[PDB]
Amino acid sequence: IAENEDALLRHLFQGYQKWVRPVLHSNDTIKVYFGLKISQLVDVDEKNQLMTTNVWLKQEWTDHKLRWNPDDYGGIHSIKVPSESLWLPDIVLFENASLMTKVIVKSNGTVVWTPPASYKSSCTMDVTYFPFDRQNCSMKFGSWTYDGTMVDLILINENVDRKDFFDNGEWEILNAKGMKGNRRDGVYSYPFITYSFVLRR
Ligand SMILES: *[C@@H]1O[C@H](CO)[C@@H](O)[C@H](O)[C@H]1NC(C)=O
Ligand SMILES: *[C@@H]1O[C@H](CO)[C@@H](O)[C@H](O)[C@H]1NC(C)=O
């Protein structure tokens, strides 16, 4: 086989600077579509009010530097590229608790990144219900480096993605909904997404 896959890569990352936002015009914000997918609830530590989860952080955005006509490159329309090479919006889980997988890049600039993660975030037993088999657990995600001027978050679904979720014997997910906030400290606006989990038993 003969791969102009190597030519596209050399042409795509020639003078690429992963630290410059890959916008066309410098006035532009980069829109990052975001969604949380849960694989399983690993453990609910009722003592320390903590929760550990296995999740994927679904991210998608446009990198206007990484755009090509497939006709020039043997009809390639998509390629897999290491996340370490790309500009990233640097979305993190806020209350410290995102492995560097590879990214998919498409000839129109769309980048799809879904890195897996394992987190231990804080919980809160619901005292309104007796017996006490409810817990309120929140996960808050947003860019660390870029304010809303430079990265805007778009929440792709009101619900956490659970199609591939593993029900663990000991707790059940009553609800898991995401909502957008735009609140952070300083003379800067920072958009974020809060996911609220209601766990039973
Ligand atoms: C690029 O093409 C894909 C289909 O492969 C599509 O899902 C995506 O919306 C396109 N990107 C843009 C920025 O239109
Ligand atoms: C816990 O979550 C439930 C469901 O969203 C809500 O009705 C309740 O007000 C919350 N209370 C606390 C203390 O978290």
Residue numbers in the entry: 1 to 97, 104 to 207
Describing publication, verbatim:
The human β3 ECD was expressed in the yeast Pichia pastoris and after enzymatic deglycosylation, the obtained crystals yielded a 2.4 Å resolution structure of its monomeric state. As shown, the structure of β3 ECD adopts overall the same structural architecture that has been presented previously for homologous proteins. Its main secondary structure elements comprise the N-terminal α-helix and a ten-stranded β-sandwich core, from which several putatively functionally important loops (loops A–F) emerge. Two N-acetylglucosamine (GlcNAC) residues were clearly detected in the electron density maps, modifying predicted glycosylated asparagine residues, one at a highly conserved glycosylation site located at the C-terminal side of the Cys-loop and another at loop β5–β6. On the contrary, loop C was found to be the most diverging region both in terms of sequence and structure with regard to the other nAChR subunits. However, as the crystal structure of β3 ECD shows, another arginine, originating this time from loop C, β3-Arg190, not present in β2 and β4, nor in α subunits, spatially places its guanidine group approximately at the same position as the guanidine group of the β2-Arg149. This in turn induces breakage of the already deficient aromatic box, slightly reorientating the rotamer of loop A Phe94 to create a distorted sandwich cation–pi assembly with Tyr196 for the guanidine group of Arg190. As Arg190 resides in the post β9-strand region, loop C adopts a previously unobserved trajectory with its lower and upper parts obtaining a closed-like conformation and its middle part (tip of loop C) being in an intermediate conformation (closed-in compared to β2 and more open compared to the agonist-bound α4 subunit).
